[PDB]
């Protein structure tokens, strides 16, 4: 009878816990079978065994030394996989890292890692682990594993085809047979998933071309495991071209058989088509989904009859029950009135589910953006054959422009420019943008508040305000004093289910004092008839504009801020109604059409084109303060802001109410006293900027993010020109009346919109040889 048992060197499990753990204890007669029980209990655990059981008398010394605890954290050798991903494929697999590490598991997990590398598509021949024990019970493992990288090492082959070339069938594959990189469309890397995709694609190709009897094909992925031999051979057997002749429908539904039949009507002599029959299935599914049966069972069976090559298409459709939705739950919108997310839905709780309707809902949420996640999970309630709960999982992330400007001036104090453009204002669904700039002599205030919802229907109420005290002055005067009081309210209703029509009023008050020397401004003055001077700056011009402001917009973007498969058109037109101190007629049109080349939408071609044509009404010219600009924005990279376009030339003046001396060169007293060819951006009344960007996450940027970086390589052509121009006043100077000032500029734009701080790199080389331009090869927007 063992009576006193002492355990030492446990350090991971208490003495009492161990004492209760082993099936033997005090107070019982420990015999040979009990010793065997202790030893086998040490053996069978499978976590640690160390048997030192000495019983000399009534003292049982059980000495077990614990390899625990160890933390293997050191992954040294990654070059193509991330240690986070390795730890995932350890943990989520079911081999999570709380480690005891018996001696076997060393080599076992070495082999396990090598097996993981076998899985990803490459080879790893060497994995060396070093043990590092620190003496409490703690150890850490040094894994140095050596890479043998290989992803596409193919030579594809298809043996058995006699109606198609090898190359034609290999083209469509998601695997490629060792082809250059400028062939790539999306992702290529060889996985068993890729192979299954290829096999299914080949089957689809035959079943579409009309080879019905083919579903029979063996696959062999032979391997020179010198990391370079992966020969895929898919030995198949074609049938014969098969003629489709007639369809029968076994229909179990409250009656639509007319519509179903007219949808499934196959003209005589057609060839059997796998994708055509699949689209027949899906169109029956939607022809039911509209009317409600959002979980029908549709089975299409082809009946093959040989010796005449006949296929009979027999589809049996049975519908479930009719009207489902019980609750429409959004979960995830922690920072946004769901009243927003619910105004969006075109599928309304308490009605009959329509799968296309909740698809419209998901797309509409996306086209508002302000967040990014696909889901329209329709999980059905427990306990009823009806009643599905439409649950979206949005994932809010805040769009908001917080633009900080500090300094910098020397003779001018520290400036303060705050640009906060918040859309879908994280309080609500409103959009407020404030560009408030006090730069030591410039007071430019812009407030823009717009309700996308002002009734239930969708009318949008948007007001804008600009208080522009633009002086850019030297001392107190004779420096283009300009005041702009700008109010405008835009009531804009969506009526074409994707087309908004906006109508608004606008008051623009323009006060112009101490005119600068530009012939363009005096041409406008002559146009208005207010006879000016020509060598004195004592010019005053108070005007008020009552502009009717009509806009139009088409928006179809399969995403929000990073469109794919989309095309938005934006027309904006100011027409000044009679009854104002000024007249003009301006029309702008933007078009951003993203078209994707890849199916995976990691490659996209952006095409954005904007026209602008402004001209004054009969007897007037369009006032210069609305002449378009270009460049230095998301218009034309490769220029300083608002530089592209006609340059206004100066008239001489040697007295302008004390024309300041030693200032304002180009035909002043201190500079040249006679005529000056003057370069400065005044903007023209016509604009055309067309740009194409290539949206490409290159293999040099780590793609764990598809929502926070877009990398563009862009070619852009921009022109700004006057249309009311002449050579009777500009004869010796360059003439600006023809579109020929095309700037071509190409550049890289890395756009990292993690909500609050972008490093928007835009390096642009502008190369289209024209004179008077002003360029810049670094743009970091905000």
């Amino acid at each position: 009878v063992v009576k006193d048992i002492h355990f030492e060197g446990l350090q991971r499990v208490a003495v009492g816990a161990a004492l209760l753990s082993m099936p033997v204890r005090t107070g019982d007669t420990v015999n040979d079978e009990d010793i065997s029980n202790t030893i086998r209990a040490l053996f069978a655990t499978g976590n640690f065994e160390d048997v030192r059981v000495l019983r000399d008398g009534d003292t049982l010394l059980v000495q077990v030394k614990e390899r625990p605890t160890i933390a293997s954290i050191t992954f040294s050798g990654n070059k193509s996989v991330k240690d986070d991903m390795l730890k995932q494929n350890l943990e989520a697999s079911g081999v999570r890292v709380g480690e005891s590490l018996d001696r076997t598991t060393i080599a076992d997990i070495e082999k396990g890692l090598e097996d993981f590398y076998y899985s990803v598509g490459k080879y790893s021949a060497s994995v060396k682990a070093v043990v590092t024990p620190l003496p409490r019970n703690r150890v850490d493992l040094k894994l140095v594993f050596q890479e043998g990288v290989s992803a596409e090492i193919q030579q594809i082959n298809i043996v058995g085809n006699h109606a198609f070339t090898t190359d034609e069938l290999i083209s469509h594959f998601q695997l490629r047979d060792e082809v250059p990189w400028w062939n790539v469309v999306g992702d290529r890397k060889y996985q068993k998933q890729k192979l299954a995709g290829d096999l299914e694609t080949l089957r689809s190709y035959y079943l579409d071309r009309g080879y019905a009897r083919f579903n029979i094909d063996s696959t062999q992925v032979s391997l020179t495991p010198d990391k370079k031999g992966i020969y895929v051979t898919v030995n198949i057997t074609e049938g014969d071209q098969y003629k489709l002749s007639g369809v029968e429908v076994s229909g179990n539904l409250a009656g639509h058989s007319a519509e179903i039949e007219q949808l499934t009507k196959i003209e005589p002599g057609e060839l059997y088509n796998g994708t055509k029959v699949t689209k027949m299935e899906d169109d029956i599914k939607k022809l039911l989904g509209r009317y409600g049966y959002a979980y029908p069972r549709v089975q299409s069976m082809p009946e093959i009859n040989d010796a005449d090559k006949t296929v009979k298409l027999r589809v049996n459709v049975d519908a479930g029950n009719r009207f489902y939705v019980r609750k429409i739950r959004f979960e995830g919108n922690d920072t946004s009135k769901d009243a927003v997310l619910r105004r969006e839905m075109r599928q309304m709780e308490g009605a009959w589910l329509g799968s296309d309707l909740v698809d419209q809902g998901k797309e509409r949420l996306n086209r508002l953006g302000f967040f990014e996640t696909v889901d329209t999970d329709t999980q059905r309630v427990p306990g009823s054959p009806d009643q599905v709960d439409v649950v979206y999982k949005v994932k809010e992330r805040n769009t908001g422009s917080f633009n900080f400007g500090i300094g910098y001036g020397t003779e001018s104090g520290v400036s303060f420019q705050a640009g906060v453009q918040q859309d879908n204002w994280l309080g609500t669904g409103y959009a407020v943008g404030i560009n408030g700039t006090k730069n030591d002599y410039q007071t430019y205030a812009e407030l823009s508040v717009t309700n996308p919802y002002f009734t239930v229907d969708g009318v949008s109420l948007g007001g804008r305000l600009f208080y522009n005290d633009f002086q850019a002055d030297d001392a107190d005067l004779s420096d283009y004093t300009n005041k702009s009081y700008g109010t405008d309210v835009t009531l804009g209703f969506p009526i074409n289910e994707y087309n908004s029509l906006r109508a608004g009023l606008g008051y623009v008050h323009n006060s112009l004092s101490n005119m600068q020397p530009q012939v363009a401004m005096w041409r406008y003055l002559y146009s208005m008839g207010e006879h000016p001077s020509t060598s004195d700056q004592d010019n005053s011009f108070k005007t008020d504009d009552f502009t009717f402001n009509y806009g139009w917009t088409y928006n179809k973007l399969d995403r929000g801020y990073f469109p794919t498969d989309g095309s938005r058109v934006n027309l904006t037109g100011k027409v000044t109604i009679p009854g104002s101190d000024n007249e003009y007629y301006k029309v702008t049109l933007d078009t951003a059409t993203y078209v994707p080349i890849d199916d995976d939408h990691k490659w996209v071609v952006l095409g954005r084109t904007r026209w602008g044509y402004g001209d004054g009404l009969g007897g007037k010219e369009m006032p210069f303060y609305e002449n378009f600009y270009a460049g230095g924005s998301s218009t034309v990279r490769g220029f300083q802001s608002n530089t592209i376009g006609p340059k206004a030339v100066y008239f001489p003046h040697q007295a302008s109410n004390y024309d300041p001396d030693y200032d304002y060169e180009c035909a002043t007293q201190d500079g040249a006293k006679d005529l000056c060819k003057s370069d400065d951006a005044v903007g023209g009344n016509a604009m055309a900027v067309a740009s194409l960007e290539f949206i490409t996450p290159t293999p040099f940027i780590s793609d764990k993010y598809a929502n926070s970086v877009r990398t563009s390589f862009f070619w852009d052509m921009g022109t700004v020109w006057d249309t009311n121009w002449d050579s009777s006043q500009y004869s010796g100077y360059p003439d600006y009346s023809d579109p020929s000032n095309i700037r071509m500029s190409a550049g890289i734009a890395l756009q990292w919109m993690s909500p609050l701080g972008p490093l928007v790199f835009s390096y642009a080389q502008p190369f289209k040889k024209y004179d008077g331009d002003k360029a810049e090869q670094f743009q970091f927007n905000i």
Partner: protein, 217 residues
């Protein structure tokens, strides 16, 4: 990450906790967690770590850690405290934002966290009605049920705005059945009144009229 003795490192950790250097405190508490997953001090450090997560407002980490603790050791005198912070953490996920600090424009964002908090606090109060946290949990629950009722009132308001009358009636049904207690439900019942009257369900509308007239003073 020093290699001090346990007593010294725990003492410094506690002192920094009373001070309020919560990020640093989380660092050395996590170190003391790794260096032993054993010891009575290990349990004390797990609790201290959940406290530190809650205070530093690392709420996903706090929720994960508290669930791990309640899974690992499900009987303990402090399971009250465990469940209480899980409820409080769901609460803080509900009420943490710029507008949730402004005090304006809330009570109908995502309620999922509020629902989870209510379930947890209900489990707490029902499991241990004789405890220090009990009355505060009761206050939690009354406020939280009021918040849920406001959420479903807000959704009912939106549907009555758009015209979705049957959605209105179902949502106010949900409010009456699940909790006819808070102010929001008494506010809501005229929504049924108007909804039934709009869909011309006359006897039903008169019935809800009787209930609202009797209930209001």
């Amino acid at each position: 990450v020093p290699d001090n003795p346990p007593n010294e490192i725990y003492a410094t950790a506690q002192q920094k906790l009373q001070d309020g250097n919560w990020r640093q405190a989380i660092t050395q508490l996590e170190a003391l967690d790794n260096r032993y997953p054993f010891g009575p001090y290990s349990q004390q450090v797990q609790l201290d770590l959940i406290y530190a997560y809650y205070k530093n407002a690392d709420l996903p980490l706090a929720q994960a850690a508290i669930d791990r603790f309640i899974r690992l050791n499900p009987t303990h005198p402090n399971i009250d405290y465990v469940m209480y912070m899980r409820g409080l953490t769901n609460m803080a996920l509900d009420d943490s934002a710029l507008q949730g600090f402004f005090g304006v424009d809330r009570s109908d964002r995502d309620p999922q966290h509020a629902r989870a908090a209510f379930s947890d606090f209900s489990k707490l109060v029902r499991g241990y009605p004789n405890s220090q946290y009990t009355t505060d949990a009761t206050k939690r629950l009354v406020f939280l049920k009021d918040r849920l009722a406001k959420y479903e009132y807000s959704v009912a308001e939106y549907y009555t705005e758009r015209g979705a009358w049957v959605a209105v009636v179902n949502r106010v049904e949900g409010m009456l059945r699940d909790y006819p207690d808070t102010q929001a439900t008494r506010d809501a019942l005229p929504l049924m009144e108007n909804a039934y009257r709009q869909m011309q369900m006359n006897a039903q509308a008169e019935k809800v009229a009787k209930i609202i007239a009797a209930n209001s003073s």
